[PDB]
Structure formats: C-alpha cells, structure tokens
Amino acid sequence: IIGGEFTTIENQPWFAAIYRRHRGGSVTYVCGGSLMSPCWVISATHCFIDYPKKEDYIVYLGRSRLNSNTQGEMKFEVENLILHKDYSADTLAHHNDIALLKIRSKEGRCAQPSRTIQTICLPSMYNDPQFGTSCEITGFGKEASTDYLYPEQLKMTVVKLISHRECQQPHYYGSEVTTKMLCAADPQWKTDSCQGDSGGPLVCSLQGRMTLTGIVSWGRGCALKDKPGVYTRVSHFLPWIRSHT
Amino acid sequence: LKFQCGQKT
Ligand SMILES: NC(=[NH2+])c1ccc2[nH]c(-c3ccc[nH]c3=O)nc2c1
Numbered sequence: 001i002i003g004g005e006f007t008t009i010e011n012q013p014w015f016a017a018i019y020r021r022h023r024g025g026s027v028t029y030v031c032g033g034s035l036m037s038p039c040w041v042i043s044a045t046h047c048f049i050d051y052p053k054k055e056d057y058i059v060y061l062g063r064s065r066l067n068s069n070t071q072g073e074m075k076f077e078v079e080n081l082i083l084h085k086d087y088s089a090d091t092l093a094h095h096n097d098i099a100l101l102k103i104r105s106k107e108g109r110c111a112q113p114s115r116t117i118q119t120i121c122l123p124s125m126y127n128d129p130q131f132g133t134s135c136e137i138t139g140f141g142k143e144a145s146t147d148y149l150y151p152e153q154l155k156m157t158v159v160k161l162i163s164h165r166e167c168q169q170p171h172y173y174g175s176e177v178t179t180k181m182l183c184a185a186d187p188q189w190k191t192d193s194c195q196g197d198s199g200g201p202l203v204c205s206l207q208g209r210m211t212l213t214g215i216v217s218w219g220r221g222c223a224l225k226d227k228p229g230v231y232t233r234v235s236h237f238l239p240w241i242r243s244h245t
Numbered sequence: 246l247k248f249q250c251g252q253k254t
Contacts, residue, residue, distance in 0.1 A: 118252055
C-alpha cells in the first residue's frame with residue numbers, strides 16, 4: 001500500500017495472507033485474500049495462474065506481520081483452488097480475476113471466529129456503492145513501486161470509488177476497464193494498492209454492513225495520477241461464487 | 246463463538 005497507516009489484523013479480521021513454499025526452506029508471500037465463510041477465502045486468479053499447485057500454498061488468518069508470528073493466527077492448507085475459467089491477462093487488465101480457496105487446518109477444520117478472525121459480507125446481486133463512497137484496502141504489498149521487498153507490518157488506507165465513465169477516459173485506462181471492474185483512487189493520488197496487495201479486499205459500507213466490494217486486481221504503477229487501482233467487481237460474480245459454495 | 250460478517254468488535 002502506498003501511504004496509508006500501519007495497522008493490526010483486529011482492524012481487518014477477514015484478511016488472509018497466502019504464501020507459497022519452495023521446500024528449499026522458504027515460504028514467500030504471494031497475495032492476500034478475504035474470508036467469505038469459515039472454509040472459503042476469495043482472492044484473484046492471477047496470483048495462482050503461474051503455479052496452480054495447491055499443495056504448495058499456505059494461508060494464514062489472524063496475522064498482523066508478514067514473516068513473524070502473531071498470537072491467535074491459524075494456518076491452513078488449500079483443499080480446493082478454484083481459478084476462473086475464461087481468466088485473461090492482456091496489456092494491463094486481468095479479466096474475471098477472482099479465485100476461491102477452500103481451506104483446511106492440519107486438524108481438519110476451517111476458520112474459528114476470534115477477535116482477529118471474522119468473515120466479510122458479500123454484496124447483493126449487482127449491488128454496489130455509488131462513486132464517491134470511501135472504501136478501505138488492506139495488505140502487505142509494496143510501499144513504493146521501486147521497493148523490491150514487502151513491509152513486515154500490515155497496512156490499510158482509504159480510497160474513493162470513481163465512475164467507469166471517469167476511469168474509461170482515454171487518458172486513464174480507456175476500454176481496458178469493463179463493467180465487471182471498479183476503479184478506486186485517492187483524490188490527491190497519494191495512497192493506493194500496489195504489487196503484493198493483489199487478491200486483498202476493497203471494503204465499503206453497503207446497506208449498513210461492511211461489504212467486500214472489490215478484489216485488488218491491476219493498475220499502472222502505484223498511486224500514479226490518472227491511473228486508478230482497478231478491482232474485480234465482486235457484485236457481478238455472485239452466481240459464480242455461489243456455484244462453488 | 247460464531248461469525249457476523251463485517252463485525253470488528
Ligand atoms: N495500482 C494498483 N492499485 C495496483 C494493484 C495491483 C498491482 N499489482 C501490480 C503488479 C506489479 C508487478 C508485478 N505484478 C503485479 O501484480 N501492480 C499493481 C498495481
């Protein structure tokens with residue numbers, strides 16, 4: 001996250017950290033995710049497309065730090081890895097960039113509710129907040145695009161939703177953004193999501209709840225002017241999610 | 246105990 005504040009999982013108790021193992025001895029962070037229900041985490045397909053070997057990923061819940069432990073964390077394995085079929089990566093965009101991971105702990109259970117582990121709400125069919133709404137994003141991604149390492153402490157920031165009309169302006173992203181995406185930016189282009197934040201949540205308040213409105217998907221640079229962050233529009237994938245829950 | 250999506254406290 002560029003800008004933002006450092007935080008603790010208690011402030012984002014539905015955030016999931018996904019890592020990959022290289023038996024060599026290291027586990028490296030891959031992307032973030034969000035807890036939908038006790039056994040299901042939702043993230044972005046582009047995070048797994050290149051190494052779709054479920055057996056090599058680990059998911060953690062209740063984690064405030066990237067490589068150190070947090071008391072209250074839960075470790076899980078990926079029982080099912082559902083990538084979207086018709087996922088496409090072009091020059092910038094990722095289409096149908098949503099993925100589901102069914103998790104299981106070494107004891108055989110799914111997540112248990114704690115002050116650091118909670119689920120996030122899903123929107124209703126094609127229901128979104130209106131542009132202007134402030135939403136928050138959270139993650140362990142880069143703090144500057146020139147960094148080659150990720151922060152050890154979790155971060156969060158607030159961004160606002162902008163219209164497609166504004167995001168599809170020729171000098172923003174043109175028609176690379178579709179109705180199945182949402183764009184969110186900082187009025188003063190100071191904070192934003194970046195590389196390492198993919199998969200994590202864009203949460204906004206809808207109908208009085210905190211809902212997962214989008215999934216961090218792509219963007220040109222990080223916190224650049226006229227280059228908003230693009231998120232997968234969860235509200236338009238409800239059927240897809242449902243057939244696998 | 247049980248989940249309540251969206252609730253932080
Ligand atoms: N501007 C954004 N909101 C944004 C979001 C996710 C990104 N992911 C990446 C990225 C950069 C390089 C390699 N892989 C990535 O996912 N850049 C990103 C930028």
